[PDB]
Design a protein around this ligand. Structure first.
Ligand SMILES: [Cl-]
Ligand SMILES: [Cl-]
Length: 352
């Protein structure tokens, strides 16, 4: 089966879908590598441990309300122009991990080179590996890119490292699987996709996870056609993940970054990686957000006037304060303690 050289020799490097080093944005760490088959089955369920430890991203909205866990699979769902790529760079810069693996699947060449240029300027550059396939690549190679990125991550997990994996995007990975399946003689099952696709998606997504000694936490991007629209592929991918961050074109338009729609987003490992006090505070802040969106639609289309009802003005100030807290430009790391102090403040505010 199709195999590639992976190891410490690819840290700081750009790989094409065959594992060839086509560029180094930092000098080689060590010439240690081994051949691995890139399309392999997930490990035995009995070989894992639970996702129980939080993965601190330094992003207030995520760490506070959508806390990720070490070994989790997390979706990033976005239409075009929602800041997905900037959020990926933020997660790389601010998360503590031993290794970052980025797989860009069917991305345009310019975007690949821009991503690599960003990595070249990163202070974590020697921990990063980028695997790419452009739109010019055949479908087989595009699938291989995601499999190879996962395989590099598994290599470092086996060395006992904490690895963070990005696959951008699972939409293009699914389309590549579909095209390979069609060209192999398979008939469309749902909305053009053969049934083989819906079985090979979990095969790729179940490979990350935690062990007693290493881990892979994985972020998978999914390209929505528009912010609010009926998408079956996205729903399926969401159904097989441990959570999803929905990015909002509306919030992006307002310059609100990260453009996370908190009420549409969830981390399914939240309860198992947070303290009871944190979970209580997050419940309170979600109740507050739902109350605030209720009042927002209530008066902001019911012709709100700043001064009519002072309770409405209190609510609007609280809404603006929470939005300002969720907004976080790059280079503004928030420690988990500081995030929790903010959560405690807004949970207090839920008592009004
Ligand atoms: Cl592994
Ligand atoms: Cl309120």
């Amino acid at each position: 089966a199709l195999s590639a050289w992976v190891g410490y020799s690819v840290l700081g490097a750009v790989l094409d879908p065959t594992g060839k080093i086509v560029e180094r944005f930092t000098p080689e760490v060590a010439p240690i590598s081994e051949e691995r088959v890139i399309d392999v089955a997930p490990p035995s369920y009995a070989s894992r441990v639970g996702v129980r430890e939080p993965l601190i991203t330094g992003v207030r909205a995520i760490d506070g309300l959508l806390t990720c866990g070490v070994g989790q699979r997390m979706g990033i769902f976005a239409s075009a122009g929602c800041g997905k790529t900037m959020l990926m760079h933020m997660l790389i810069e601010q998360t503590e991990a031993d290794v970052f693996v980025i797989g860009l699947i069917g991305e345009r060449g310019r975007e690949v080179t821009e991503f690599v240029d960003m990595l070249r300027a990163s202070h974590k550059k020697e921990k990063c590996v980028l695997v790419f396939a452009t739109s010019d690549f055949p479908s087989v190679d595009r699938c291989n890119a995601a499999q190879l990125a996962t395989t590099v991550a598994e290599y470092f997990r086996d060395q006992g490292k904490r690895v963070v994996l990005f696959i951008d995007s699972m939409t293009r990975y699914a389309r590549a699987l579909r095209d390979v399946a069609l060209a192999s003689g398979e008939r469309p099952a749902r909305r053009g996709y053969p049934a083989s696709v819906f079985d090979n998606l979990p095969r790729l997504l179940e490979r990350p996870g935690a062990t007693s000694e290493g881990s892979i936490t994985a972020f998978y991007t999914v390209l929505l056609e528009s912010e609010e629209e009926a998408d079956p592929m996205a729903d399926e991918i969401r159904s097989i993940l441990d959570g999803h961050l929905y990015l909002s074109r509306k919030l992006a338009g307002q310059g609100h970054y990260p453009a996370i729609d908190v009420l549409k987003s969830v981390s399914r490992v939240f309860g198992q990686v947070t303290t009871p006090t944190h979970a209580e505070q997050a419940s309170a802040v979600r109740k507050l957000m739902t109350r605030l969106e209720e009042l927002q639609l209530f008066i902001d289309l019911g012709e709100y006037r700043p001064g009519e009802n002072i309770d409405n003005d209190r609510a609007m100030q609280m809404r603006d304060s929470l939005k300002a807290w969720l907004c976080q430009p790059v280079a503004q790391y928030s420690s988990f303690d500081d995030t929790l102090s903010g959560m405690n403040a807004f949970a207090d505010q839920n008592s009004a």
